[PDB]
Amino acid sequence: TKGILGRKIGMTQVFAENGDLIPVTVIEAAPNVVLQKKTAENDGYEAIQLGFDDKREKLSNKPEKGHVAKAETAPKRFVKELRGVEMDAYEVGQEVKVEIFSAGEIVDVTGVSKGKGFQGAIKRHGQSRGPMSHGSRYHRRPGSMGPVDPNRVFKGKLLPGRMGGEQITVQNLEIVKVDAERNLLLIKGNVPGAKKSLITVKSAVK
Amino acid sequence: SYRKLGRTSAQRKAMLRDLTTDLIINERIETTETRAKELRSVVEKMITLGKRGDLHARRQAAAYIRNEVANEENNQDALQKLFSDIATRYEERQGGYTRIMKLGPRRGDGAPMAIIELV
Amino acid sequence: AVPFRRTSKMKKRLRRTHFKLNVPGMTECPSCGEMKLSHRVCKACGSYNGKDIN
Amino acid sequence: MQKLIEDITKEQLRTDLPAFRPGDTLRVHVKVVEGNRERIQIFEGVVIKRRGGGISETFTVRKISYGVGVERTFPVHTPKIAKIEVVRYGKVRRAKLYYLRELRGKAARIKEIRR
Amino acid sequence: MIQQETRLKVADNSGAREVLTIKVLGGSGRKTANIGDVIVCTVKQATPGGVVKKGEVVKAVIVRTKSGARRSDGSYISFDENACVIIRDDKSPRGTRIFGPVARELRENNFMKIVSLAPEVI
RNA sequence: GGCACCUCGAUGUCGGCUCAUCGCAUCCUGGGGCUGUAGUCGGUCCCAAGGGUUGGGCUGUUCGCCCAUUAAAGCGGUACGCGAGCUGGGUUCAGAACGUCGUGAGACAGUUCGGUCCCUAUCCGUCGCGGGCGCAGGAAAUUUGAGAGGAGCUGUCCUUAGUACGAGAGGACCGGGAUGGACGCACCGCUGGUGUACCAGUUGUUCUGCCAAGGGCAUCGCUGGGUAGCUAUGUGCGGACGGGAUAAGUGCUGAAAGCAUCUAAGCAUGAAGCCCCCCUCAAGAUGAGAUUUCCCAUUCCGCAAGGAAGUAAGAUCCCUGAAAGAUGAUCAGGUUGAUAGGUCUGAGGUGGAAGUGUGGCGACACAUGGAGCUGACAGAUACUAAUCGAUCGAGGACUUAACC
């Protein structure tokens, strides 16, 4: 498997050199760096921890400073790790850049979704609401709790609450275009997460 | 965004206009904190109009601030006081003509009071 | 829409455990003499950030 | 973001489109392909909307056809619009000319500006 | 988006003038319908002299709608009326001639017979 | 239905709406036996509860019949599920009326018109979010995965192939490819909605001394548009390919019981079912796990049980905010800094400003001039605000091996 760590900048459209028109999401990914090569014999599994964005020394605490000291680079703001990659393929501290991907590849993208705050049942789980007329005083309520015999309400009934902020995955996205000189990726379609948020890009498992 | 201030759009606009006029009048003003925070941008924008000083700016400002007397012996309306005196005093410093000093909360409701001053 | 059993003294106190209000933020005014809130003009000294305010 | 986006889309945005306003009447050549036979279907109508920025910026045009109106909308910088020519400049006020949808039958006069 | 009980304007000389959508053919429960696919419908009012009377059930293809279609190119085609053409299940129209423009959608959604009879295709 | 056992110091009755959830005696989809199974289509039975299992006319009605479809339009339980969730159309009050019975007041599982549906959630329970403490030092991150939750549905068409099969009519299994219906997730680039500190026109009255130009009110006065954000009817994406053990079924070998035998000993194969592969949560997993890195093991007292008091790393208070937000919280920043507001330059939106001059009796029309204005949108900029501070925050017990 392969992947890189980047930031979502915006969304636009691009023509595919056929007459068709493609909507595309624009992701910038300055060259990531591998910080730690997690290996089975000590850590119980194989993986690489890598970091993307930089931090000023004012914000870089001494612990993470010493941690990154092995890779000998600037303290990295965001760090994440990928499984299933070949340990031997990556030296510790080497850069990943974006040319590892290329136009035409199928891709799966994951990231935190847009927050939406305390929302009602209709907005949250999309279930119909009572009639708006004929004297109905049941405009936007979340439904009956449950039967009587169990003398309680079962687990897992859908009720109001917070929304957004859980990492989501979109499967089988396509990399329309890549611009290494800018450190730019262009994914077909749309991706979770607000603007300038962190997005992670992985080769599709399927 | 912009604060709703807990009142409809009409009287919100009227209140902001009154606050701006009172600032031009007194040069120092004591209100609650959030009123001051909202007042900051609009008053320092009126300052930009005053510094620009063209007749279009005169009419734009007159469409906003209200005609109370600012210097009774000279009968300086707020418009002329602004454009002549205040705009000249603030033509030198390219934006940011305001301050917010925070005070202890008021006795009645404990709301956070603030001092605005053009400076 | 009605309590079914009177709440015990223990439950009452336990609910009240978090009802306390926390102390404000004190900072000794650099202008000498007394204490003040942070980022608030000192009530007594009438000064802030060194500069004197009338 | 805005500067970056226009930087990555400037190479694709077209260059050979004459200036026109939402109130003008105008002809467009669309290189439709039918049966493995590319051919220009010619469409004449009155512009209504110019909306959007960058390459996103898109425009619309309206034709009356056999007693039925048809509104055609294109992305402006599309590759399969072969040629484009304004035939007459219209003198109107509004920015988006929505009211011709309701209004029909020579009450929809478009004064020629000659400017 | 033509819809159940939506009223359609007949676009041919089969004698019918207005039809009422019985509902849209296709999947189990279909809420909507765009240009291209047959729908079952009853003629609600019709010209006196014609092969179609008043109030029989027939099948028609919606030929143009005022909610437009989208193309993979990115263009859009919107009309000022919702109209349909009556068809027997061999996909040929029952009318000898049709009126008004017609969407290109009906060629790949194969109704090339109707397209050929049509006076204008966009 | 029979009984009257709980409830008449009150347990709200039909149907519908909202929300579901369970059984399988299966309506579809999956896998098989038999068939009076030629083939497409069927009938019966077995395994199978993963998912799905439609919109209208009539009626208060469930139930039914009807229209049009779909793969199918399953049967039941949950106080004939669900009124401190809703509806009140009917039964079940007081008014009135028709028929009938009654000498009569009046009465009809006979009918008809009308007819007040109360409640601030205390405790369990459910959906979210915080604080405290523990994890035999204190911190900043990354993680293992026990163990939970979601999805897990399907049509049509091209081909194989007019091929098997069928005098014929008609028409395949199996296997490839495209596309669709409903759902679910995500997001404004597109089409649109909204957009009440954006732009423009416009009626009445009133005010800014007057003209001009503006202000207040009139649903934001009304109307035509519309940035960001939010958003679906808009767009992208998924239920894919597979592994293991099985259900029914089919079996190979082979006796019991020289034969036969899917069986008792062995070996296989075999479902939308089961366990994984997919996605999310997850160390309060008190069994509190692992890895990477930093701080170091001071000062006081009974010397020592063990206490308290300044600190290390690192946090907090307080302040500027949002991509976050009910408030906590999370995230971006606090002067060697772009966190927010200004200022300047743009995007987009409105769309031809004021003032002038020209033409015209005039309302008005041109030029100045893609002008003027512009909320959130993105760049730069130290102009104002984030200052002085204070608080919290380590010094570490027996044994196996092995080494100062």
PDB file of C-alpha atoms (C1' of nucleotides) in Angstrom, chain C residues 1-7 11 15 18 23-28 30 36-40 48-51, chain F residues 84-85 119-124 130-132 317-320 333-335 384-391:
ATOM      1  CA  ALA C   1     -43.895  15.573  35.406  1.00  0.00           C
ATOM      2  CA  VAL C   2     -43.495  15.201  39.156  1.00  0.00           C
ATOM      3  CA  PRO C   3     -40.908  13.767  41.575  1.00  0.00           C
ATOM      4  CA  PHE C   4     -41.875  10.269  42.685  1.00  0.00           C
ATOM      5  CA  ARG C   5     -39.655   9.987  45.777  1.00  0.00           C
ATOM      6  CA  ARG C   6     -38.276  12.803  47.902  1.00  0.00           C
ATOM      7  CA  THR C   7     -34.574  13.283  47.262  1.00  0.00           C
ATOM      8  CA  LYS C  11     -28.517  13.053  46.774  1.00  0.00           C
ATOM      9  CA  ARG C  15     -25.955  17.216  43.153  1.00  0.00           C
ATOM     10  CA  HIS C  18     -20.622  20.968  41.392  1.00  0.00           C
ATOM     11  CA  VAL C  23     -12.504  32.030  42.212  1.00  0.00           C
ATOM     12  CA  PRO C  24     -11.973  34.755  39.568  1.00  0.00           C
ATOM     13  CA  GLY C  25      -8.536  35.487  38.100  1.00  0.00           C
ATOM     14  CA  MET C  26      -6.427  37.734  40.315  1.00  0.00           C
ATOM     15  CA  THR C  27      -3.307  39.591  39.214  1.00  0.00           C
ATOM     16  CA  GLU C  28      -1.471  42.116  41.370  1.00  0.00           C
ATOM     17  CA  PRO C  30       1.800  46.526  38.446  1.00  0.00           C
ATOM     18  CA  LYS C  36      -7.094  43.390  40.206  1.00  0.00           C
ATOM     19  CA  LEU C  37      -8.667  41.193  37.565  1.00  0.00           C
ATOM     20  CA  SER C  38      -6.642  40.158  34.531  1.00  0.00           C
ATOM     21  CA  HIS C  39      -7.090  42.161  31.307  1.00  0.00           C
ATOM     22  CA  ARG C  40      -9.401  44.508  33.258  1.00  0.00           C
ATOM     23  CA  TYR C  48      -3.794  49.351  32.689  1.00  0.00           C
ATOM     24  CA  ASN C  49      -0.686  48.098  30.887  1.00  0.00           C
ATOM     25  CA  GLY C  50       1.292  50.789  32.695  1.00  0.00           C
ATOM     26  CA  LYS C  51      -0.502  53.625  30.918  1.00  0.00           C
TER      27      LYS C  51
ATOM     28  C1'   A F  84     -46.899  12.144  30.683  1.00  0.00           C
ATOM     29  C1'   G F  85     -45.225  11.297  21.641  1.00  0.00           C
ATOM     30  C1'   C F 119     -48.628  18.060  33.244  1.00  0.00           C
ATOM     31  C1'   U F 120     -42.091  22.887  34.414  1.00  0.00           C
ATOM     32  C1'   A F 121     -38.882  14.983  34.217  1.00  0.00           C
ATOM     33  C1'   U F 122     -37.517  13.438  40.591  1.00  0.00           C
ATOM     34  C1'   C F 123     -35.299   8.140  39.846  1.00  0.00           C
ATOM     35  C1'   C F 124     -34.178   4.135  36.382  1.00  0.00           C
ATOM     36  C1'   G F 130     -18.076  17.620  30.758  1.00  0.00           C
ATOM     37  C1'   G F 131     -15.421  17.333  35.727  1.00  0.00           C
ATOM     38  C1'   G F 132     -12.971  13.869  39.599  1.00  0.00           C
ATOM     39  C1'   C F 317      -5.655  30.889  34.823  1.00  0.00           C
ATOM     40  C1'   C F 318      -6.609  35.033  31.745  1.00  0.00           C
ATOM     41  C1'   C F 319      -7.107  37.098  26.547  1.00  0.00           C
ATOM     42  C1'   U F 320      -7.898  37.170  20.382  1.00  0.00           C
ATOM     43  C1'   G F 333      -2.980  32.005  18.444  1.00  0.00           C
ATOM     44  C1'   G F 334      -1.147  35.368  22.764  1.00  0.00           C
ATOM     45  C1'   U F 335       4.110  40.334  20.561  1.00  0.00           C
ATOM     46  C1'   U F 384      -5.915  48.491  17.798  1.00  0.00           C
ATOM     47  C1'   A F 385      -6.529  44.165  20.797  1.00  0.00           C
ATOM     48  C1'   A F 386      -3.987  39.146  22.963  1.00  0.00           C
ATOM     49  C1'   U F 387       0.937  43.156  29.348  1.00  0.00           C
ATOM     50  C1'   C F 388       2.518  43.071  33.297  1.00  0.00           C
ATOM     51  C1'   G F 389       1.413  38.283  36.099  1.00  0.00           C
ATOM     52  C1'   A F 390      -0.205  34.144  39.189  1.00  0.00           C
ATOM     53  C1'   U F 391      -1.535  28.748  39.939  1.00  0.00           C
TER      54        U F 391
END
